Symmetry: C6
Subunit: 202 residues, 6 copies
Amino acid sequence: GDWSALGKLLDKVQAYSTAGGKVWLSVLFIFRILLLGTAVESAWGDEQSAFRCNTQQPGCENVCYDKSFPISHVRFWVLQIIFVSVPTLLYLAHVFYVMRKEEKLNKKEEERGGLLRTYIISILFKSIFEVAFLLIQWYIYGFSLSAVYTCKRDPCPHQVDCFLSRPTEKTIFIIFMLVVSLVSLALNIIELFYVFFKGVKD
Amino acid sequence: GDWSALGKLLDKVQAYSTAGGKVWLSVLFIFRILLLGTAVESAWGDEQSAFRCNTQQPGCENVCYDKSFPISHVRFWVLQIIFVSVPTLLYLAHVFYVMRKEEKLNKKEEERGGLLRTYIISILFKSIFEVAFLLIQWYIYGFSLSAVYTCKRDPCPHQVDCFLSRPTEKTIFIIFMLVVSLVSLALNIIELFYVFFKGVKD
Amino acid sequence: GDWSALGKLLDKVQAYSTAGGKVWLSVLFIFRILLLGTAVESAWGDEQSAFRCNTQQPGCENVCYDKSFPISHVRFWVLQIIFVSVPTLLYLAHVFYVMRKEEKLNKKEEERGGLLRTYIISILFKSIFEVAFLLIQWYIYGFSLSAVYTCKRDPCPHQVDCFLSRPTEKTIFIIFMLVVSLVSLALNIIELFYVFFKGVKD
Amino acid sequence: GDWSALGKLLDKVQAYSTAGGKVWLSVLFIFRILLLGTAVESAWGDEQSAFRCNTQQPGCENVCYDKSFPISHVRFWVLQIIFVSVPTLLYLAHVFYVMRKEEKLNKKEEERGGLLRTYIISILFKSIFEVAFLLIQWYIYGFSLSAVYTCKRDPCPHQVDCFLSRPTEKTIFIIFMLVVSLVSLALNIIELFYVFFKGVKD
Amino acid sequence: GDWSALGKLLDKVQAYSTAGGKVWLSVLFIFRILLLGTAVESAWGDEQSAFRCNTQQPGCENVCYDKSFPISHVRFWVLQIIFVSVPTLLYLAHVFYVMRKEEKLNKKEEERGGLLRTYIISILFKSIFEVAFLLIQWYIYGFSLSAVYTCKRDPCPHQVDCFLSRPTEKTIFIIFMLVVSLVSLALNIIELFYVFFKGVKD
Amino acid sequence: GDWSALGKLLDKVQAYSTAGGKVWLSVLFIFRILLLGTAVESAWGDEQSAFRCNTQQPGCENVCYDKSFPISHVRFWVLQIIFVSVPTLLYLAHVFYVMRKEEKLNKKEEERGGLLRTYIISILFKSIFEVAFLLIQWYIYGFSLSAVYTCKRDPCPHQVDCFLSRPTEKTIFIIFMLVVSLVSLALNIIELFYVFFKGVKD
Ligand SMILES: CC(C)CCC[C@@H](C)[C@H]1CC[C@H]2[C@@H]3CC=C4C[C@@H](OC(=O)CCC(=O)O)CC[C@]4(C)[C@H]3CC[C@]12C
Ligand SMILES: CC(C)CCC[C@@H](C)[C@H]1CC[C@H]2[C@@H]3CC=C4C[C@@H](OC(=O)CCC(=O)O)CC[C@]4(C)[C@H]3CC[C@]12C
Ligand SMILES: CC(C)CCC[C@@H](C)[C@H]1CC[C@H]2[C@@H]3CC=C4C[C@@H](OC(=O)CCC(=O)O)CC[C@]4(C)[C@H]3CC[C@]12C
Ligand SMILES: CC(C)CCC[C@@H](C)[C@H]1CC[C@H]2[C@@H]3CC=C4C[C@@H](OC(=O)CCC(=O)O)CC[C@]4(C)[C@H]3CC[C@]12C
Ligand SMILES: CC(C)CCC[C@@H](C)[C@H]1CC[C@H]2[C@@H]3CC=C4C[C@@H](OC(=O)CCC(=O)O)CC[C@]4(C)[C@H]3CC[C@]12C
Ligand SMILES: CC(C)CCC[C@@H](C)[C@H]1CC[C@H]2[C@@H]3CC=C4C[C@@H](OC(=O)CCC(=O)O)CC[C@]4(C)[C@H]3CC[C@]12C
Ligand SMILES: CC(C)CCC[C@@H](C)[C@H]1CC[C@H]2[C@@H]3CC=C4C[C@@H](OC(=O)CCC(=O)O)CC[C@]4(C)[C@H]3CC[C@]12C
């Protein structure tokens, strides 16, 4: 049970990458998924059951929660990490099929090119998605949470004060994820610069 | 432990497919199942416990919820994704048995045809199911949710106002799924056009 | 790691079956288990917590629920699908042991029969169980659910109105399962007719 | 990856068994564990939360529940199925070690007996445990449940009426398990009779 | 895929053990983990939600529960079973590394001792931990539970009566675990006596 | 299926380590993860639902809980154990790639150094993280919990007394984790001293 075809595929996929990029970028993905699945996912469990508002009006809590949180952070991060990893899978499948076709051609008729361009495009799109998600998060929420929220949506009469759950831990986790995203963006830009320098000097 | 029979089966199954269809259509299924299982399934958890109506009448909440939501979106999508994937499994089993029979025939007696038609039929049925589900969803619900619902079902007296849970996130997820379905439909139609052009020109 | 003994066992088990029966009957089992485990099992979760009755008498809700639902549909279906699949497992084990004994005999002493009857018996019993379960379900419940139930069991005084949870989705799922069961019954009867015709003409 | 040592161990373990016992007794274990893990385990979930008594005295519900149910049925059945399966595992380990020692002896010094007795003892103990558990269950509970219970334990004043959850489904499952246990006992006694007849006639 | 190195490691690890100890001690661990994970873990679920005290003072329930149960039984048993199994893992790793080093030495330079002492030390420490845990449990709790508890901790005024959940089942499980622990201790002492007798007579 | 490349990688990774460090440090990680995942994670489940304060003011409980527990202990420990294990994974990947490159070089052109420095750096960083986390925990919380907390945050009027859940078990687990961390730190420092002594004397 020798896993040599996996080695061939891995070597072909990582032909144009640097030595460092083969390590940090791979470990960061594992770090990200572990942190997302273990710690943060449980702090957001009681985000609506422990949300309280000061009023007797039936229906103000629902509308005020929907106004405060149009989309939860955890699902935003899940979307972010899904959109960032699909280009690599597409490239891997492309390489797999190309290798199979080349092997068939070699066995049948013996009885720098497109791949670099695809690699560059994938690396560009990953950074584009990172920047877009960061900008959207900055515009909608920010990078902090306050304990008291003021609601002025009907049928609440003239105003309402509402109180959040765990507004301090979530800030810490938000900052952690921001740092991780910035590190990933920098590591992805370095690869583009290296590739273009190699392609220009020679 | 060489997995060569899997390669033979894969090559036989994807004989008439294009180069692109071998990649995007496969990755889209993984994207779909991951998104369905991770993010959306948790937003619909408190769909009946956090549903509130303004009245003292016992029994109005149950009937009004049943009137508003005859069937949840998540289970509708589960049915949609199950009905779209069975034709491929049937075709795969058919090819498996045909290959086994051909091998037996070759070993025993040496001591464009039906498969294309089945492929075309499967591709047609997948698109048919996609369109049918989209039309049903458009007729029953639409592609948005409102925060306030008006109920006029007995025993509620003369009318009742009821309030939903997370009416903004669900709209976002609905739009995402709509886009995914449209992309899948287009990618399936392209294959039919390509196959018919190849079969007509030659 | 060649899986050839599995192939021998599979060919021996499916010797008397038709070409179609090797595909539809196998896929239907997967469809059934997936649908049972994913969608329906979650709709029946709040079947007793969201069941409400109009009264102040302590104890009427419990007795009225027990009177309305002597046994839940999901567990009835689990029993149905367990009782329908055991004959095949028994036949498979029988074939396995017979093959081992035949191999031992061949190696030791060289230093249409019972199996058809067992196959017929198993196919008969599967249909018998299907019909029995369908008849019991028809007699006890029917194939629909109503939103309001009338209870006349002690200690409830003179009568009580009670209200169910999700009475419309469950009807849809009931109809789905009924259709699946009918399809399975028809596909099983076809095999008996084919076998008897082959055994009579030759 | 040929699994021949597993075959040798299986043949050695089942040397003195009948043809039928190799099939029904093995399938019954799978049936038992599936039924225990899928259906019954969920019906007993709300056994204490939905238990209600008619009184204002704080503490009567706890003591009356503890008096009605000294031990739940599901855990009783788990103990029953654990105590019935350990002798076979002990015998299997004994055979494994004996085979290893015999192989070592054969390679080193070539440079009806105890096993039957152990088999008989294990078969006897399995039936003994079955009978003991059945008798205990008959003495403590019976084979049915009633909807209303009468409690006369302090601090409840002079008497209390309490009401159970799902008293009709549980009776059905109890009867099912009783039938399964009786079938297992009969199948185990048959093996003893067969073994003793073979050992006496020859 | 022959698993011969596993056999070598197993034979080396169990060189000084008796015939019986290779069976009962191994099966007892499986029995213990199964019983701990299946039955008992669910009876302790509602240990604080169903705990009730007779008073209106806010805060007496929390302090009285903390006074009654400084540590739950299930977690005590988890610690007990973890502390008893680590010496064997350490010894196994030691043997693994020693065997690798010996193989390297044999291939390089051909181009009763410490292990017994380690075995004895491990066997001693297992019994020491068993006895220590039993003594601590006897001192803190005992081997039974009563339904009514009397609390005299502030801010409760002058006294309070509190009521437990399932005080009869837990006694049964406690007795079961006590018996298992005693059996394990005896089986471990037998090995020490056998080893010392063999080492003294010869 | 011989796992010899795993052996080569393991021997290369642990070339500069002592004999003891190959055992205790590996077993301690398993001990840590088992203890974290089995016992402690369930004691912190009802940390906010069972937290109670004496007042009628809506919103004081949320703010007072957020003030008492800026971050839960379990998630702090998860972060601690994640930050301590990434350097080893980075070093392992580095060694893997270096070995592959060396093999390629050997096959192509035949048709104490950096690794020690990386090992030292990783060992230093692990201890640095341990010390930093211990200091932060000491500064923020301490190593004990009290049953009564005094809150002076708005909108609570002038003061509030609040009561915690399970304040005695958590102290025990905190002490356990502290001891484990200290042991790990000592075992890591020993390796640095040994390495430097070997590098200086020779
Ligand atoms: C549900 C299962 C069947 C499919 C889901 C898993 C895949 C989507 C995984 C398998 C390997 C993963 C990759 C492993 C590591 C990397 C690190 C990083 O890529 C790199 O830069 C690697 C270094 C390099 O090649 O230069 C970005 C994420 C990525 C591609 C991962 C993206 C997600 C991948 C493709
Ligand atoms: C529970 C387990 C035992 C069975 C359930 C899994 C199957 C139903 C999976 C295995 C592979 C899956 C397929 C993998 C990828 C594709 C992509 C797509 O098909 C294609 O067009 C592939 C590209 C081509 O062949 O042209 C539509 C879904 C489909 C068939 C998937 C449908 C679901 C399949 C058959
Ligand atoms: C927990 C694990 C170890 C055992 C539980 C799984 C088995 C009970 C499964 C394995 C394969 C399954 C079978 C696979 C497919 C078929 C389709 C169908 O049988 C057929 O008619 C197959 C076609 C034919 O042979 O003619 C009825 C169910 C059955 C026998 C399934 C019944 C359940 C089986 C035996
Ligand atoms: C957690 C894992 C690692 C161990 C737990 C599983 C075992 C305890 C299983 C493996 C195979 C099982 C056995 C498979 C089938 C049989 C049927 C039956 O035994 C027979 O009579 C078999 C027929 C015969 O040999 O005559 C009684 C239960 C028993 C021994 C089972 C008892 C439980 C066993 C030993
Ligand atoms: C019942 C027995 C006879 C067989 C079943 C147990 C084995 C599978 C155990 C015994 C010794 C274990 C090994 C002992 C020590 C280590 C710890 C660990 O060592 C490392 O590689 C540390 C990582 C690093 O090098 O930095 C990796 C797993 C490994 C090889 C263990 C793998 C599993 C082993 C082989
Ligand atoms: C999470 C995974 C990767 C590691 C956790 C599992 C181990 C800690 C297991 C593997 C085998 C187990 C052992 C299997 C059986 C025995 C029986 C018993 O030891 C004996 O006396 C065996 C008989 C003998 O050798 O004399 C005490 C527990 C012990 C060592 C077990 C302790 C726990 C062990 C080492
Ligand atoms: C989700 C899966 C795919 C990846 C997550 C698991 C890894 C991060 C594991 C695999 C082996 C583990 C290691 C096994 C044992 C050790 C013991 C210890 O390292 C040692 O000192 C080993 C002894 C030595 O080499 O001197 C510190 C933790 C470490 C490196 C572990 C850190 C976590 C590791 C790398």
